[PDB]
């Protein structure tokens, strides 16, 4: 019975019932884990066994974080999260650090347990129920539900936000420079000190916390070769928007003209100062493609002119925190991926290109997921909200392995799309 604190009420969005999502297959290696970490949570009684009588459900799976080599249970509370919401956006929204993006070194702390110490609203508990697969379906599933604020549920941080703001009041007053943001199960701490100092300061916060019972994971650092642990910190500076460009041909076959006509045409939607007529003229009659058309000075006049318009920020762009976020990803080629984050069609807030993780094993699924997580992390720092993903992949395939390479406490909202190479504008070069 963890805390004397009085339970805060929550009621899912009107005319909407709780989650009734099925449990996807889990691989031994995960069940085993998912069991042990559920058996023990049951004893400390943060969780409680339950049977059929509870009509709701949500799925669970676990990921062995490479970050700490310690398995972490993960409940896909996206439906439930959606259902319940006057809560975390309107009622107890947690403000955003204008300047978290502005730091040069930010780290994420998994402050999940901090939650296992607050009683979950009495009535609202039927909703967080989940189940556990058994290999070869040897026995029925093992259902349970939460009694304390749950992990990865938009409500926790909102509810805990009170005690969290207290636990950090000191650290922040004694260290006014550091900036701290909380998004669900994580703590975003960013500084402007040398990396060596940051590491320290972060390692020191991991203390001030511990003095409060909030224990955070033990990220390991190996002394053999790939010093992966060197990338733990985020640096919102190599964060550079990637505008579009129009290649350069010494001479331009017919082909070359058209392609560049379309791109220039598409882009017109983004930036409205793109003209094509005085440039497309050079293509007037049904001619062979392979023909080396020469660039009029009337034409070239704008070819290089239009490009000048592609080297800058967009037209009266703004970010409305009241709308959802969307992100698009196009498998560009040989490990390369590019994306755009927008709320309104053709009025993006960002573009860029996740290059690649050298250990991408030449796996587009793996790389893709990683791009997602990556892109997701950015959105959180920058605007403080997760974007809905338009995933360049076939549902059924993505659903088969996204977990395997997933290494995050949260899960973003996604959908699938088969939309071929529209123009090459979403630029490859």
């Amino acid at each position: 019975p963890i805390s004397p604190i009085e339970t805060v009420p929550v009621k899912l969005k009107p005319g909407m019932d709780g989650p009734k999502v099925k449990q996807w297959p889990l691989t031994e290696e995960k069940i085993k884990a998912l069991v042990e970490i559920c058996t023990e949570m049951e004893k400390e009684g943060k969780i409680s066994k339950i049977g059929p009588e509870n009509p709701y459900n949500t799925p669970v799976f676990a990921i062995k974080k490479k970050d700490s080599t310690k398995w972490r249970k993960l409940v896909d509370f996206r439906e439930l999260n959606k259902r319940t919401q006057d809560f975390w956006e309107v009622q107890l929204g947690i403000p955003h650090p204008a300047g978290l993006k502005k730091k040069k070194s930010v780290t994420v702390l998994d402050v999940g347990d901090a939650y296992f110490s607050v009683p979950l609203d009495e009535d609202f508990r039927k909703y967080t129920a989940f189940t556990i697969p058994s290999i070869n379906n040897e026995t029925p599933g093992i259902r349970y539900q939460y009694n304390v604020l749950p992990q990865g549920w938009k409500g926790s941080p909102a509810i805990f936000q009170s005690s969290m703001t207290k636990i950090l009041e000191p650290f922040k007053k004694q260290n006014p420079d550091i900036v701290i943001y909380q998004y669900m199960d994580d703590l975003y701490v960013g500084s402007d000190l040398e990396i060596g100092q940051h590491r320290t300061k972060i390692e020191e916060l991991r203390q001030h916390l511990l003095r409060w019972g909030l224990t955070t994971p033990d990220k390991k650092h190996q002394k053999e070769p790939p010093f992966l642990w060197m990338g733990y910190e985020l640096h919102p500076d190599k964060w550079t928007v990637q505008p579009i460009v129009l290649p350069e041909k010494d001479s331009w076959t017919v082909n070359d003209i058209q392609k560049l006509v379309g791109k220039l045409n598409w882009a017109s939607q983004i930036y409205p100062g793109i003209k094509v007529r005085q440039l497309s003229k050079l293509l007037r009659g049904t001619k062979a493609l392979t023909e080396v058309i020469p660039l009029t000075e009337e034409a070239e006049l704008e070819l290089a002119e239009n490009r000048e318009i592609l080297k800058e920020p967009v037209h009266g762009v703004y970010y409305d925190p009241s709308k959802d976020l969307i992100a698009e990803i196009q498998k560009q080629g040989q490990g390369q991926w590019t994306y755009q984050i927008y709320q309104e069609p053709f009025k993006n807030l960002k573009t860029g290109k996740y290059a690649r993780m050298r250990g991408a094993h030449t796996n587009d699924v793996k790389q893709l997921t990683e791009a997602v997580q990556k892109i997701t992390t950015e959105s959180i720092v920058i605007w403080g909200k997760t974007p809905k993903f338009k995933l360049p992949i076939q549902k059924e395939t993505w659903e088969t392995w996204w977990t395997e390479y997933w290494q995050a406490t949260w899960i973003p909202e996604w959908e699938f799309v088969n939309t071929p190479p529209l123009v090459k504008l979403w630029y490859q070069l």
């Epitope: 590491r199 320290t200 002394k223 053999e224 070769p225 790939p226 010093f227 060197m230």
Partner: antibody, heavy 123, light 108 residues
């Protein structure tokens, strides 16, 4: 401004322990990437690795001598030591202590060295 | 116990010359090789880290190269201070290991 200085007994009696003290300045044994390594070099022969003591204390030993070697520090005084047990004549060599640092995801090197101490085993 | 070898033991060149030394590993140590310069006195300095990168304040006439198991140090054009023993250390898996050094002498 970084510097390291090996301290030692110079000459040790066969099958007795000896203890090298590496006093440095210009970095702490706290700053994340850091660590001290102890290299050995017998008279006229080449460099041999002994051990490296890291800031997290995930010290790693030369397998061929772990049973005798033992590394440690006193981060407050900026010293790092190395104790060798039951030394034999073969242990006679010049000992270096170097400042090893893991800079990035791919770089780890013993950037600065001392001058070494001359430890000789002879009764 | 990843054996590091420098075939050429004692090599002798002359001022002006350009030389290259061999450091062959026992496995694809993935460019996790460092280069050291021990001058006849006895002090050891860092030249190259990560097969090819240059340590601060190290003459440009210094170059590193190698891949997987074969690596090489190339001194552009000799000077009087370059004429001393050379060491390559592999830091891809403890225990760490250095070559056997390559004595760089002066042909007379």
């Amino acid at each position: 401004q970084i510097t390291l200085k090996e301290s030692g007994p110079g000459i040790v009696q066969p099958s007795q322990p000896f203890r090298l003290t590496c006093t440095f300045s210009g970095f702490s044994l706290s700053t994340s990437g850091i660590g001290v390594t102890w290299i050995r070099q017998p008279s006229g022969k080449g460099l041999e690795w002994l051990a490296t003591i890291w800031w997290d204390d995930d010290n790693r030993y030369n397998p061929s001598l772990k049973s005798r070697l033992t590394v440690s520090k006193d981060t407050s005084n900026n010293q790092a030591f190395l104790n060798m047990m039951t030394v034999e004549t073969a242990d006679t060599a010049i000992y270096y202590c170097a400042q090893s640092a893991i800079t990035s995801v791919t770089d780890s090197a013993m950037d600065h060295w001392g001058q070494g101490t001359s430890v000789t085993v002879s009764s | 116990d990843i054996q590091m070898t420098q075939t050429t033991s004692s090599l002798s060149a002359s001022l002006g010359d350009r030389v290259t030394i061999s450091c062959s590993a026992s496995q694809d140590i993935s460019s996790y090789l460092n280069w050291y310069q021990q001058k006849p006195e006895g002090t050891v300095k860092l030249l190259i880290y990560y097969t090819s990168s240059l340590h601060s304040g190290v003459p440009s006439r210094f170059s590193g190269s190698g891949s997987g198991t074969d690596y090489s140090l190339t001194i552009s054009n000799l000077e009087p201070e370059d004429i001393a023993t050379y060491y390559c250390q592999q830091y891809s898996k403890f225990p760490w290991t250095f070559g056997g050094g390559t004595k760089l002498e002066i042909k007379r």
